[PDB]
Amino acid sequence: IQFTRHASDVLLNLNRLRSRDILTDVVIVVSREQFRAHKTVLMACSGLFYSIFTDQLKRNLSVINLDPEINPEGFNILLDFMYTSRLNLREGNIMAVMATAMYLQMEHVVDTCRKFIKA
Amino acid sequence: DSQIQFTRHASDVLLNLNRLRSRDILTDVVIVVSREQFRAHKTVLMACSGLFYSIFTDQLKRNLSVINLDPEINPEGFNILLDFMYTSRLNLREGNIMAVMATAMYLQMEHVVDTCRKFIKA
Ligand SMILES: Cc1cc(C)n(-c2ncc(Cl)c(Nc3ccc(Cl)cc3)n2)n1
Ligand SMILES: Cc1cc(C)n(-c2ncc(Cl)c(Nc3ccc(Cl)cc3)n2)n1
């Protein structure tokens, strides 16, 4: 038996845990801005976080600092996407979202941004 | 803002969380049922079950690394439900239906309980 709403229900509940700061186990720092999250959700969405949270050096760190070129607004848009399946874009931030998704190794998001930029 | 909906995203997240469970990556709790051990992610358990949600939101129990389920709970019934939590697939059959329904009632998974009731009535 297949429950079509199950995965979206799980994601909705994970986003509720994030909003309530329940079992968040990492702070992602982007140009001093802090983002509280679940390492499992981050690894499930990003090639970069899969690498970081399996990394012998970084796996137990409670704080991860992204490279200094990374845009905090771009990161916030992508973190919201990870937990909701909804990507919120504007003409003024789409390039920063694309650059962030490239860094986070989120190819389908990169491709979606790229196609919208060309359109 | 322009809003793009990724309709397969939620399913891809769940698939990847199940892959982490399979490889025992970031698992932070062992659920013990009649001494049978089940490794899982607390957040996934909370997202699927009223019982787990109440256990890990409770600050006294939030950091427990082992949770023992009530003695009346069948490990096979729990295994079916744990697989459902991580896959959206519920493997119901005549031989396990009573045990699966009883476990879903205990775990407070009312949608699954309803599905079990429909299976018995069919
Ligand atoms: C066979 C298989 C294929 C994938 C993508 N797996 C997998 N399993 C678990 C996780 Cl958390 C995860 N995350 C993740 C996401 C984005 C990127 Cl580019 C890389 C890896 N990916 N497994
Ligand atoms: C306002 C609100 C509504 C829900 C369903 N919330 C919620 N948020 C987060 C989680 Cl993890 C969670 N799990 C969960 C699942 C099964 C059962 Cl019976 C009870 C609660 N439930 N919050």
UniProtKB/Swiss-Prot annotation, chain A:
Induction line = Down-regulated during maturation of dendritic cells by selective stimuli such as bacterial lipopolysaccharides (LPS), CD40LG and zymosan. Protein levels decreases upon genotoxic stress in a dose- and time-dependent way.
Q: Which domain of life is it from?
A: Eukaryota
Q: Let me know which tissues express this protein, per UniProt.
A: Expressed in germinal center T- and B-cells and in primary immature dendritic cells.
Post-translational modification note: Phosphorylated by ATM in response to genotoxic stress. Phosphorylation induces its degradation by ubiquitin/proteasome pathway. Polyubiquitinated. Polyubiquitinated by SCF(FBXO11), leading to its degradation by the proteasome. Ubiquitinated by the SCF(FBXL17) complex, leading to its degradation by the proteasome: ubiquitination by the SCF(FBXL17) complex takes place when aberrant BTB domain dimers are formed.
Q: What is the residue range of the signal peptide feature?
A: none
Q: How does it assemble?
A: Homodimer. Interacts (via BTB domain) with the corepressors BCOR, NCOR1 and SMRT/NCOR2; the interactions are direct. Forms preferably ternary complexes with BCOR and SMRT/NCOR2 on target gene promoters but, on enhancer elements, interacts with SMRT/NCOR2 and HDAC3 to repress proximal gene expression. Interacts with histone deacetylases HDAC2, HDAC5 and HDAC9 (via the catalytic domain). Interacts with ZBTB7 and BCL6B. Interacts with SCF(FBXO11) complex; the interaction is independent of phosphorylation and promotes ubiquitination.
Name of the protein this chain belongs to: B-cell lymphoma 6 protein
> What is the protein's species of origin?
Homo sapiens (Human)
Give the lineage.
Answer: Eukaryota, Metazoa, Chordata, Craniata, Vertebrata
Gene that codes for this?
BCL6
